[PDB]
Design a protein around this ligand. Structure first.
Ligand SMILES: [Zn+2]
Ligand SMILES: [Zn+2]
Ligand SMILES: [Zn+2]
Lengths: 49, 86, 39, 50, 122, 97, 55, 98, 76, 99, 166
């Protein structure tokens, strides 16, 4: 019940659209949440060090 | 801000602290020897029940020669309930 | 149930899926067995 | 329906078993009555009763 | 595709020969084109096994002779594997029973070999 | 897709599903919701009950108990989302007989 | 090239709202069907720029 | 010569047994480890980083870039999961009442 | 022998669909069709003629089963 | 619009069309009119058998242009579809095998 | 040669209904078990007979007739001591390559027990003098599919004398 590993799903669940009309792409919210989680983990590791 | 990491951390990260060596002494040596003797002698003990082999290929005249023979201890049926008799 | 069947993509038990059909093929149940000569 | 611009859907089965089941169970000639009370719904309408 | 018993009952070469002959005659009587083109390994394996069993001396055998040989060996307290090997090989010489056949020690007796040869040759 | 300009098809809503269930056309409902909408073949491991790929189970590192199975792509996506949520649906397959 | 005749006359011709790369010699269908996000997916997805996604 | 192996079986699902996975089972199920917080590379091609998010080894989402784990296109790729280890454990909101 | 002898509409539909699929899969015809290019029409003709080689296996809730032939059942 | 209600209970399908309705008393109660434009788009997969072989041959010779016809053919051996708009339709009709 | 009990779910297409069910099942089983080695069983030759054949079901999918048939099949699986007569289909330095008559080229007798004049110099030399007999010793099977043969066995050739051929 207490989680120590997060299961990032495949890319089929996180569709990404390459919008060549601008310098950006359309990404889902799960990708941003996982990116924020990884950033927070890195920040916690930096603070611990 | 925290820097980004390209490759993942090592599966077995190194540590600057090593385990303290094992205590030496005739006592420890004798305990090790006794534990090894127990490991070697308890497998052949009748209490060590092995997986009953099955699915024999054929019967041969050498069956009586290769027949495994080992004495079997008799449990105390007075102390053990009746639900364990063969 | 029916909802789980529809979700999994299998014929629901209700309706036409409650029973099963058999083929009326020309056969012979328990055909003659070849006798064993060596045994 | 009242023929006042209503958009209806039309589907084509892709299996012989589904086709047969749709023709038998969902047949117009076999579903001329409703299971609520058995009254016939497929009957005459305006411009026909008169 | 699971199997229930891989050693249900042993059989000699005469049964396999009869089965292969029956399959071959049924095939040449009801030959099909598409069924044969779908899998040609069946024809090859059947033909080669039949050719091997014809090369071997398994010919000139019958169920009556097999039953007679079995009843004759039943009086020799010989084991199923020994009698099966003897029926499959049809040894005409004595050395083939003296050395080739296993479990020779205490079973030859130097007197039963003549009876075994007579029974396998009759 | 949804819209006509996007080359979208009709929607068999919950009311249509209820009507089909009331009629009892099980094969019709199946052909509509599974065969002609999101038909797809996956590989399920008969040992752990997980989903593999190309007839291979990365969990058990074996391919003897892996077998194909028809399943809606929406149901497969739901199973993947649950496995991500840590709710692991263990599928125990068996013969159709 | 075509898997049947080996010809290189592969043309992308949409047949009644169905993108399909089909050969022009024998009509063999090489590839068919394309996956494109719908209005719901486009509205649910959020726009993130390279200034942030690249690093 | 040739071994007997069944090609396809008419397997029918009997029942779904829900459950949970431990960290060890999650690691065993996952294929790679995602540790990079960025998505694409610095080059102008904007290719996805390795051992990071949006990696093609955990499936594919583009019709041009196929999957790296299995040599198949998007229409045939089923996808693969990944495991991300956390420094400190956290309560699972779904199982917090439990 | 305890169930109703009449053949229900669901059984009718399932039998007709199965026979139409078999015929579309190049199955033998036992009625000598006369220019019927529709497998469903051929199946309906075979049902009316009572020559469909299919046996319904009705299962009871407890687990028992009973066989009923198309020619043995009553049609409407 | 969830996975249970939006993608499992109610989902979209193909081979369907939405159109306006109009009155026509000259048709039976069990009959419905379908326009040629939607009929040429909505196709039905028919298996080649010993009964409708000539009908399928005629439909293939007609082709996608004429209303009575077909649009694609999937061979029994190979699952590679063939577009009737390209290539000689007469050869495809003459090489129609069962299955 | 030995019988093996098997239970297989055979699927017969509809266009074979004109044929007899038992004959079709036998032909399908033969085509499916022709020249194939079943793990821990041996190499199957052909079908012997059919014992039990229950009702024939028809699923709502493919529409074919699926029948669960119990049958017995003959397989080549010695009993670790069987004697056979094969032919030398070549020879290698580490060991001769003998093969039963047109049956299977999988017998690899190790040359580590004959009298102490055993050696192969690649010139197809069998053995220095003082229809080849074979004595099976052990069996062994292995799998094939391990990513996204299977029967060799061990042969023995003791000092059988062989008065007919050295
Ligand atoms: Zn597994
Ligand atoms: Zn081409
Ligand atoms: Zn993949």
């Amino acid at each position: 019940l207490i989680l120590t590993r997060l299961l990032v799903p495949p890319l089929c669940i996180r569709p990404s659209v390459v919008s060549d009309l601008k310098s950006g792409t359309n990404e889902d919210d799960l990708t941003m949440k996982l990116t924020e989680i990884i950033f927070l983990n890195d920040v916690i590791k930096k603070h611990r060090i | 801000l925290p820097d980004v990491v390209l490759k993942p951390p090592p599966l077995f990260p190194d540590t600057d602290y090593k385990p303290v060596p094992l205590k030496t002494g005739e006592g420890e040596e004798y305990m090790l020897a006794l534990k090894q003797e127990l490991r070697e002698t308890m497998k052949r003990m009748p209490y060590f029940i092995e997986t009953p082999e099955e699915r024999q290929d054929i019967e041969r005249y050498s069956k009586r020669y290769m027949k495994v023979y080992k004495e079997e201890w008799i449990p105390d049926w007075r102390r053990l309930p009746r639900e364990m008799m063969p | 149930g029916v909802s789980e069947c529809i979700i999994m993509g299998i014929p629901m038990n209700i309706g036409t899926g409650l029973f099963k059909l058999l083929h009326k093929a020309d056969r012979d149940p328990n055909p003659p067995k070849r006798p064993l000569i060596f045994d | 329906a009242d023929f006042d611009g209503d958009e209806m859907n039309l589907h084509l089965p892709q299996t012989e078993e589904a086709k047969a089941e749709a023709l038998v169970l969902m047949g117009t000639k076999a579903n001329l009555v409703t299971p609520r009370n058995g009254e016939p719904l497929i009957a005459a309408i305006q411009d026909f009763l008169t | 595709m699971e199997v229930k018993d891989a050693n249900s009952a042993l059989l000699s070469n005469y049964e396999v020969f009869q089965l292969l002959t029956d399959l071959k005659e049924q095939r040449k009587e009801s030959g099909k084109n598409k069924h044969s083109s779908g899998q040609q390994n069946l024809n090859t394996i059947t033909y080669e096994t039949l050719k091997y069993i014809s090369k071997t001396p398994c010919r000139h055998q019958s169920p009556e002779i097999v039953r007679e040989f079995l009843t004759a060996l039943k009086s020799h307290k010989l084991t199923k594997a020994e009698k099966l090997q003897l029926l499959n090989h049809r040894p005409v010489t004595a050395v083939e029973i003296q050395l080739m056949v296993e479990e020779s020690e205490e079973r030859l007796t130097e007197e039963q070999i003549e009876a075994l040869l007579h029974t396998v040759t009759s | 897709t949804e819209g006509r300009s996007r080359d979208g098809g009709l929607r068999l809503g919950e009311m249509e599903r209820d009507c089909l269930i009331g009629y009892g056309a099980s094969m019709l409902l199946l052909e509509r919701l599974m065969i002609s909408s999101d038909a797809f073949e996956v590989d399920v491991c008969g040992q752990c009950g997980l989903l593999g790929y190309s007839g291979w189970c990365h969990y058990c590192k074996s391919s003897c108990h892996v077998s194909s199975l028809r399943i809606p792509y929406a149901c497969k996506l739901l199973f993947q989302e649950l496995q991500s949520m840590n709710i692991i649906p263990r599928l125990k397959l068996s013969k159709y007989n | 090239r075509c898997p049947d005749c080996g010809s290189t006359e592969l043309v992308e011709d949409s047949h009644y709202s169905q993108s399909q790369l089909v050969c022009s010699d024998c009509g063999c269908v090489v590839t068919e069907g394309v996956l494109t996000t719908t209005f719901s997916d486009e509205g649910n997805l959020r726009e993130v720029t390279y200034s942030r996604s690249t690093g | 010569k040739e071994q007997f192996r069944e090609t396809d079986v008419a397997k029918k699902i009997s029942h779904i047994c829900f459950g949970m996975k431990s960290p060890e089972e999650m690691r065993q199920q996952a294929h790679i480890q995602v540790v990079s917080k960025n998505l694409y590379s610095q080059d102008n091609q904007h290719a996805p980083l390795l051992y990071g998010v949006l990696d093609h080894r955990m499936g594919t989402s583009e019709k041009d870039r196929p999957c790296e784990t299995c040599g198949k296109n998007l229409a045939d790729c089923l996808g693969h999961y990944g495991y991300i280890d956390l420094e400190l454990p956290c309560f699972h909101v779904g199982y917090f009442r439990a | 022998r305890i169930t109703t002898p009449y053949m229900t509409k669901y059984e009718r539909a399932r039998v007709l669909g199965t026979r139409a699929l078999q015929i579309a899969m190049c199955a033998p015809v036992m009625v000598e069709l006369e220019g019927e290019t529709d497998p469903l029409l051929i199946a309906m003709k075979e049902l009316k003629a009572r020559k469909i080689p299919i046996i319904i296996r009705r299962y009871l809730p407890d687990g028992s089963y009973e066989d009923w032939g198309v020619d043995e059942l009553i049609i409407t | 619009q969830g996975r249970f209600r939006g993608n499992l209970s109610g989902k979209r399908v193909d081979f369907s069309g939405r159109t306006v309705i109009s009155p026509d008393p000259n048709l039976r109660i069990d009959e419905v009119a379908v326009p040629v434009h939607v009929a040429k788009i909505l196709t039905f997969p028919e298996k080649v058998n010993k009964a409708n072989i000539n009908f399928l041959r005629k439909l293939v010779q007609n082709g996608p242009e004429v209303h009575p016809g077909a649009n694609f053919i999937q061979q029994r051996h190979t699952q590679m579809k063939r577009f009737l708009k390209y290539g000689n339709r007469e050869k495809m009709a003459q090489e129609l095998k069962y299955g | 040669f030995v019988l093996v009990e098997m239970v297989d779910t055979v699927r017969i297409p509809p266009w074979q209904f004109e044929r007899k069910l038992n004959d079709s099942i036998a032909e399908e089983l033969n085509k499916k078990l022709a020249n194939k080695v079943v793990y821990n069983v041996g190499l199957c030759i052909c079908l012997f007979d059919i014992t039990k054949l229950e009702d024939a079901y028809v699923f709502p999918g493919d529409g074919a007739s699926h029948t669960k048939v119990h049958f017995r099949c003959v397989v080549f699986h010695p009993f670790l001591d069987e004697i056979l007569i094969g032919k030398i289909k070549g020879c290698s330095p580490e060991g001769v390559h003998v093969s039963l008559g047109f049956f299977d080229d999988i017998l690899i007798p190790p040359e580590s027990l004959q009298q102490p004049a055993k050696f192969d110099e690649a010139e197809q030399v069998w053995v220095w003098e003082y229809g080849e007999e074979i004595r099976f010793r052990v069996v062994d099977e292995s799998f094939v599919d391990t990513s996204p043969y299977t029967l060799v066995g061990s042969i023995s050739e003791p000092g059988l004398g062989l008065l007919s051929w050295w």
